[PDB]
């Protein structure tokens, strides 16, 4: 037996407040980051059009066998087109519930879903075509080509809800990242099939995300608010314990099915809803979801963040540290890059960066008074962006160094952050050299400029 979550909230922007979708996420955070997900439905007449063929584009997704509180990687078989797989797709669901696939009920599917993952001697599998790159593929949204693009595909083509603009916007803070992330800053595409899903997680960084359906049968969303989720995740450590195994990669990540039910019964708050075509759905920082699509259909998601979220997202690199979790970026060296632009920052952008900006320096400059007083005296100059991340990881926590680190030539090439100085070699401190990337002198105007910037 399934008791459906509550509903998530929806809204309807009018097109005043749908025109600047920064703008119109602020406006609903109050009420959307109480449950995690909402739902928004664009204006009636706001229908982008739909580039991507269903002959010339091929995929090969992955399996997945349906049982709950079980351990998936978070990225890892024949090849379909898009044409082969929506047959198979509508060939399965028709074929397991006996039915014409448009007539059976989402509130059954549901049920169905959750009654299989739980019940172990049926043994059911189902394809997902999951992560494939907007880059590879090619966007479902309209963008610039130098084919030409009709006059309705003109008008979507600057839109902030194509999904290929919202993180290239400047009120977007990762767009000023210069690095390559891409599994950041570029739409990913999901074609899913009835029962096929995803499983309980948060994105890199507890950024934002935002989610298009461009077509087909519904997508059912579970999703739980940021406040809860450390409660979601002592929940699931007594439940699945296999899961918080920590992973040698960033790409080793571990995720499970668990019914929200099971969630409910411990007081954990989660709401649900069926997107359907032509919807978004957002998900807010550090906001728990997972899901499973009613059908054939076809989705577009990105991450994004904002500047409401730059706490958050040094709190998560603090976070990752203490649980030795690889990072995708550099948080500080994003800070300092953007500072070093504060000329051509959003006036709002910049104020909030100076603020993290100010906690960065005190912090650093807590943390450099500690090794020296270690007897850490030598020092030198380093550019740590030159460096491949994987070069600049502390050897303990994993983090991604940027402000500075720890060297011996006792080791050569390793470093540490600064919190794992007694963790670099067994020689006297006073071998070590402090590998910096800015004096406070530097960071100081660095900050002014900033202040500068956010007071005209
Ligand atoms: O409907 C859904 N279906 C499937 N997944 C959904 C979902 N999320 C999926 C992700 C993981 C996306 N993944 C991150 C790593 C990315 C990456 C980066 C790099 Cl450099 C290399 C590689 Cl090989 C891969 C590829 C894209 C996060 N949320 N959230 C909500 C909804 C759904
Ligand atoms: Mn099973
Ligand atoms: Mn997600
Ligand atoms: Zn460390």
């Avoid at 070699?425 to 956010?454: E, F």
Wanted: glycine fraction near 4%; hydrophobic fraction near 40%; proline fraction near 7%.
């Amino acid at each position: 037996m399934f008791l459906p979550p509550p509903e998530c909230p929806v809204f309807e922007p009018s097109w005043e407040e749908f025109a600047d979708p920064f703008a119109f996420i602020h406006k609903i955070r109050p009420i959307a980051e109480q449950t995690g997900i909402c739902k928004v439905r664009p204006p009636p007449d706001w229908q982008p059009p739909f580039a991507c063929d269903v002959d010339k584009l091929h995929f090969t997704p992955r399996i997945q066998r349906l049982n709950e509180l079980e351990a998936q990687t978070r990225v890892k078989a024949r090849d379909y087109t898009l044409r082969t797989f929506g047959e198979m797709a509508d060939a399965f669901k028709s074929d397991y519930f006996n039915m014409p696939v448009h007539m059976v009920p989402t509130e059954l599917v549901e049920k169905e879903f959750w009654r299989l993952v739980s019940t172990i001697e049926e043994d059911v599998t189902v394809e997902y075509g999951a992560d494939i790159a907007s880059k590879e593929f090619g966007s479902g949204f309209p963008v610039r080509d130098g084919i030409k693009l009709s006059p309705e595909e003109e008008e979507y083509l600057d839109s902030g809800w194509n999904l290929n603009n919202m993180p290239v916007m400047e009120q977007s803070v990762l767009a000023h990242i210069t690095a390559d992330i891409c599994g950041m800053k570029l739409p990913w595409l999901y074609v899913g099939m009835c029962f096929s899903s995803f499983c309980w997680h948060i994105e890199d960084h507890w950024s934002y995300s935002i989610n298009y359906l461009h077509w087909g049968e519904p997508k059912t969303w579970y999703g739980v608010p940021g406040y809860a989720a450390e409660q979601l995740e002592n929940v699931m450590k007594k439940l699945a314990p296999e899961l918080f195994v920590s992973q040698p990669d960033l790409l080793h990540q571990l995720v499970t099915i668990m019914n929200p039910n099971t969630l409910m019964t411990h007081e954990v708050p989660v709401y649900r809803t069926n997107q359907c075509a032509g919807e978004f759905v957002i998900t807010f920082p550090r906001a728990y979801h997972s899901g499973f699509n009613q059908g054939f259909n076809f989705a577009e998601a990105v991450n994004f963040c904002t500047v409401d979220w730059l706490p958050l997202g040094r709190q998560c690199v603090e976070h990752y540290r203490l649980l030795h979790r690889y990072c995708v970026f550099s948080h500080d060296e994003m800070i300092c890059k953007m500072a070093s632009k504060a000329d051509v920052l959003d006036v709002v952008v910049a104020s909030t960066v100076q603020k993290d900006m100010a906690i960065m320096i005190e912090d650093e400059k807590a943390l450099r008074e500690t090794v020296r007083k270690l007897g850490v005296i030598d020092s030198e100059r380093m550019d740590f962006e030159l460096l491949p991340d994987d070069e600049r990881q502390c050897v303990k926590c994993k983090t991604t160094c940027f402000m500075s680190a720890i060297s011996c030539s006792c080791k050569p090439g390793l470093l540490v952050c600064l919190h794992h100085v007694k963790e670099l070699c067994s020689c006297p401190p006073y071998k070590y050299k402090l590998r910096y990337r800015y004096t406070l002198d530097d960071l100081y105007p660095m900050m002014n400029a900033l202040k500068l910037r956010a007071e005209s």
